[PDB]
Amino acid sequence: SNKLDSKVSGNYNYLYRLFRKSNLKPFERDISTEIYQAGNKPCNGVAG
Amino acid sequence: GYFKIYSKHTPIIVREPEDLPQGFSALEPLVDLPIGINITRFQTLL
DSSP, X not given: OTTTTSOSSOOOOOOOOOOOSSOXXXXXXXXXXXXXXXXXXXXXXXXX | OOEEEEEOOOOOOSOSTTOXXXXXXXXXXXXXXXXXXXXXXXOOOO
């Protein structure tokens, strides 16, 4: 698929996940994660 | 991977409250359709 999908401009609509606490089951898919303020930081939006 | 459904109806003749009908009755499979669904809780529809 380097000659079909990857092309002159590239189809950048292929997203992938990196962080979840509930991992995948056999034949199961998470369609939308719920990312909230998991950290208990006092200053919201800290650097680093 | 999917949802299995078993059901059978019973003509009850015994008292309805404070009682479950004593006896044996196996439930035959009725429908089983391929839906890959994650299920944690459920709720009835009255």
